[PDB]
Structures are given as C-alpha cells and as structure tokens.
Write an enzyme that holds these catalytic residues in place. Structure first.
Site, short mmCIF file in Angstrom:
data_model
loop_
_atom_site.label_atom_id
_atom_site.label_comp_id
_atom_site.label_asym_id
_atom_site.label_seq_id
_atom_site.Cartn_x
_atom_site.Cartn_y
_atom_site.Cartn_z
N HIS A 131 -6.85 6.93 -3.03
CA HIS A 131 -7.68 5.93 -2.33
C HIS A 131 -7.01 5.19 -1.20
CE1 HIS A 131 -5.88 2.54 -4.57
NE2 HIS A 131 -6.48 1.74 -3.68
N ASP A 132 -5.67 5.15 -1.17
CA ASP A 132 -4.91 4.52 -0.09
C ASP A 132 -3.86 5.44 0.56
OD1 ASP A 132 -6.06 1.93 0.22
OD2 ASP A 132 -4.90 1.13 -1.44
N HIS A 155 1.14 1.13 -5.89
CA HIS A 155 -0.23 0.60 -5.90
C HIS A 155 -1.24 1.66 -6.28
CE1 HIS A 155 -3.99 -1.32 -4.72
NE2 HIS A 155 -4.18 -0.38 -3.77
N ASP A 190 -9.03 -1.55 -8.04
CA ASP A 190 -8.35 -1.87 -6.78
C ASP A 190 -8.07 -3.38 -6.67
OD1 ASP A 190 -7.16 -1.21 -4.29
OD2 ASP A 190 -9.06 -1.31 -3.22
N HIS A 224 0.81 -1.23 0.00
CA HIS A 224 0.00 0.00 0.00
C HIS A 224 0.83 1.26 0.00
CE1 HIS A 224 -3.02 -3.02 1.49
NE2 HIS A 224 -3.71 -2.43 0.49
N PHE A 266 -9.03 -16.23 -2.70
CA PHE A 266 -9.34 -14.80 -2.92
C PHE A 266 -9.98 -14.56 -4.29
CE2 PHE A 266 -7.73 -10.38 -4.03
CZ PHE A 266 -8.70 -9.72 -3.28
N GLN A 289 -4.46 -16.97 -2.76
CA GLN A 289 -4.82 -16.32 -4.03
C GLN A 289 -5.99 -17.01 -4.73
OE1 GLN A 289 -3.57 -13.23 -5.06
NE2 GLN A 289 -2.71 -13.41 -3.00
C1 LIG Z 1 -2.04 -9.51 -5.45
C2 LIG Z 1 -3.39 -9.11 -4.93
O1 LIG Z 1 -4.38 -9.38 -5.57
C3 LIG Z 1 -3.48 -8.39 -3.61
C4 LIG Z 1 -4.87 -7.79 -3.37
C5 LIG Z 1 -4.92 -7.13 -1.99
O2 LIG Z 1 -4.99 -8.16 -0.99
C6 LIG Z 1 -6.16 -8.50 -0.39
N1 LIG Z 1 -7.01 -7.56 0.00
C7 LIG Z 1 -8.18 -7.79 0.60
O3 LIG Z 1 -8.96 -6.72 0.93
C8 LIG Z 1 -8.52 -5.50 0.51
C9 LIG Z 1 -8.65 -5.13 -0.83
C10 LIG Z 1 -8.16 -3.90 -1.26
C11 LIG Z 1 -7.55 -3.03 -0.38
C12 LIG Z 1 -7.39 -3.42 0.96
C13 LIG Z 1 -7.88 -4.64 1.40
C14 LIG Z 1 -6.69 -2.29 1.67
O4 LIG Z 1 -6.47 -1.23 0.73
B1 LIG Z 1 -6.87 -1.63 -0.53
O5 LIG Z 1 -7.64 -0.67 -1.14
O6 LIG Z 1 -5.77 -1.84 -1.32
C15 LIG Z 1 -8.56 -9.11 0.86
CL1 LIG Z 1 -10.07 -9.47 1.64
C16 LIG Z 1 -7.71 -10.16 0.48
C17 LIG Z 1 -6.49 -9.86 -0.15
C18 LIG Z 1 -5.59 -10.90 -0.55
N2 LIG Z 1 -4.89 -11.74 -0.86
MG LIG Z 2 -7.74 0.56 0.65
ZN LIG Z 3 -6.07 -0.17 -2.68
#
Ligand SMILES: CC(=O)CCCOc1nc(Oc2ccc3c(c2)CO[B-]3(O)O)c(Cl)cc1C#N
Ligand SMILES: [Mg+2]
Ligand SMILES: [Zn+2]
EC number: 3.1.4.53
Length: 323
Positions: free
Chosen positions: A113-114, A77, A231, A73, A285, A282
C-alpha cells in the site's frame, strides 16, 4: 537471534505485536518476515499454490522498493499495516464472512500500500508539478503509484505469486487490491466513514453474533475500511509503540517542511519544525480522523474492538496531558 524472533512471532495474531523487534531480529526485513509468517499461518501458500521460493523472491523485491532513508513510510510501516490487517481479518464478528481470495487480497493490499513512497504527501507532489501528479491528474497520486509498482513487480522473474489463481480470481483480486489501496487516500476518508456509518445503522447480525453481508458492495466497503483502519492504527497500539511511530512520522513531516521552506512554498500542517507541537497534532489527528473511524469500526464489530478503542482514548488523553 532465531529464538528471539520466534518469541516475538508468538504474538503474530495479536494486536500490538512488536514489529520493531521483529525488524531487529530479522536484520531489517520486517515485511518479508511478517508476510511469510502470516501466509504460513493462514495456509495461503498451500491454498493458492504459491511456492516458498516465489513468495520470498517477490516479498524481498517488494521490500527493496520501500525506501530505507524515509523515516515512516518504509517497510516497517508496511509490515505493521499487513500484520494489523491480518489481525482485523480474524475479528470474531467477521468469522466466516470473507472468502480466501478476499483475505489474500487484503493482506497483499496492506503489504504493497505504500511501496516506493518518496517521503512527501500528495499535496507536495501536486504543488511541485511532479511527474506522478501529471500522470494521475492529482487524483490519489501516490496510491495509484503504489498499485503500479506493487503489480508490476509480479512480472519480475520468479515473482508471480498469483500464477495459480484462476482467471476470474486474478481479475477480482486485482479490483479488490485497487479498492483497498485507494482507500488509504485521505481524500476518500469522509466518504468511506459515511458508508461505514450507514452499514452500522443497518447491520444484520446472526444468533452467534456474526455480521451478515448480503452483496459484494457491502463486503468491499468493510474491507476498504479495514485496511484504512489498519493504516491509521498507530494511535490504538500500546503507548510505547505509538510514541515510536509518532517520532518517525514527525521526522518525515519536518523533512517535507524543510523542502517546502527552501522551495519558497507554504509549509504544510504539522511540518514546520520551529512552530509545530507533536502533542497537539496527535490529539487533533485522533479527534478529527482516527477516533471517528475506530468508534464506527467498534460499533460494527461490537464488542470485539473494545480494548482497541479504550487504548485509543487513553493514548489521546495521555498525549493531551503532555501538551
Ligand atoms: C503515529 C501516527 O499515527 C502517524 C499516522 C500518519 O500520519 C498522518 N497521516 C495523515 O494522512 C495519511 C494517513 C496515512 C498515510 C498517509 C497519509 C500516507 O501514506 B499512508 O498510507 O501511510 C494525516 Cl491527515 C495526519 C497524520 C498525522 N499526524
Ligand atoms: Mg499511503
Ligand atoms: Zn500507510
């Protein structure tokens, strides 16, 4: 250096622009670089009468308020989500749908946003009785904070990029930016997706194949979902980019788990470095969050997100095979 950066920026309007290389050739200023490129590309400085000095001064200050010592973050990003939002705004099914103000608001929302992310989740701040959690009653704690910092920086010297907007434009843009930043709170994910599914089930399309939006509520619900999609766009990018994002997020997740362990708290999902699997996390997710969202987005803008959804499904199966 300059020729290399220019070569990377040939993909400014494309999915899977290498923002990591952009960071490298801009001396670790990807957010300022990509936002200046996006604003020049869309004529946003001319349309909203923003000087290059005012825009650069704000963007540099915004980028400084992203934490360099957090793995995921940070300003890279933010730059990635802004550029991805810039691409989604130009999807053929949404041609001539959104106003200039809505376009400005979405890209700005993505940029801020972050901002000022501490590297921990909302649940961590709630469970530790943080000042931020107290301020916002545990509701969208960090997302409220991101808005507070992003907006307050406009009041710094030579930083008000919205000075030449009209009063109604300033008021409306504020509302829309709040809506889009709050839409990045995972607590609102299921409600956003339910609204997106409703719009897909009752969509109105022209002869050319462009989506018709009757009222402000339909427009903002698409824009909310667009920034949320941007995001959560890492798994839909080319595998070499996605793997780099996965390395960064797990580093930040394991750091939170270390903080939770030493405080004597229960370690959050995907945060215990001793037991957690990167590959299983992943796939889980993607299956429960990312794929349902992007499949519904693809149905809304069909066939414009076909290659993106294919990439998401291929990356899902690749990661699953590495378990
Ligand atoms: C390589 C990726 O795809 C990482 C995605 C981010 O990783 C996660 N994020 C989650 O929830 C949020 C999603 C977005 C954001 C945040 C939390 C806080 O700021 B933000 O806007 O970036 C959940 Cl529930 C799981 C993962 C996993 N892995
Ligand atoms: Mg966020
Ligand atoms: Zn984000």
């Amino acid at each position: 250096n300059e020729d290399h950066l220019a070569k990377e920026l040939e993909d400014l309007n494309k999915w899977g622009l290498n923002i990591f290389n952009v960071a490298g050739y801009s001396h670790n200023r990807p957010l300022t670089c990509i936002m200046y490129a996006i604003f020049q590309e869309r004529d946003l400085l001319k349309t909203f009468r923003i000087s290059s000095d005012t825009f650069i001064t704000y963007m540099m200050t915004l980028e400084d308020h992203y934490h360099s010592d957090v793995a995921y973050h940070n300003s890279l990003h933010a730059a990635d989500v802004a550029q991805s939002t810039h691409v989604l705004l130009s999807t053929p099914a949404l041609d001539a749908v959104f106003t200039d103000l809505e376009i400005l608001a979405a890209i700005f929302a993505a940029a801020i946003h972050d901002v000022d992310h501490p590297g921990v989740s909302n649940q961590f701040l709630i469970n530790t009785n943080s000042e931020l959690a107290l301020m916002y009653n545990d509701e969208s704690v960090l997302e409220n904070h991101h808005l507070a910092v992003g907006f307050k920086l406009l009041q710094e010297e030579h930083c008000d990029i919205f000075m030449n907007l009209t009063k109604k434009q300033r008021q409306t843009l504020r509302k829309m930016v709040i809506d889009m930043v709050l839409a990045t709170d995972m607590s609102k994910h299921m409600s956003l997706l339910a609204d997106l599914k409703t719009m897909v089930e009752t969509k109105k399309v022209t002869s050319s194949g462009v989506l018709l939006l009757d009222n402000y509520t339909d427009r903002i619900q698409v824009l909310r979902n667009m920034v949320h999609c941007a995001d959560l766009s890492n798994p839909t990018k080319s595998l070499e980019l996605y793997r780099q994002w996965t390395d960064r997020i797990m580093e930040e997740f394991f750091q939170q788990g270390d903080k939770e362990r030493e405080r004597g708290m229960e370690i959050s999902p995907m945060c215990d470095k001793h037991t957690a699997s990167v590959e299983k996390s992943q796939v889980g997710f993607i299956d429960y969050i990312v794929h349902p969202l992007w499949e519904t987005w693809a149905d809304l803008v069909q066939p414009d997100a076909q290659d993106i959804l294919d990439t998401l499904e291929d990356n899902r199966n690749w990661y699953q095979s590495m378990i």
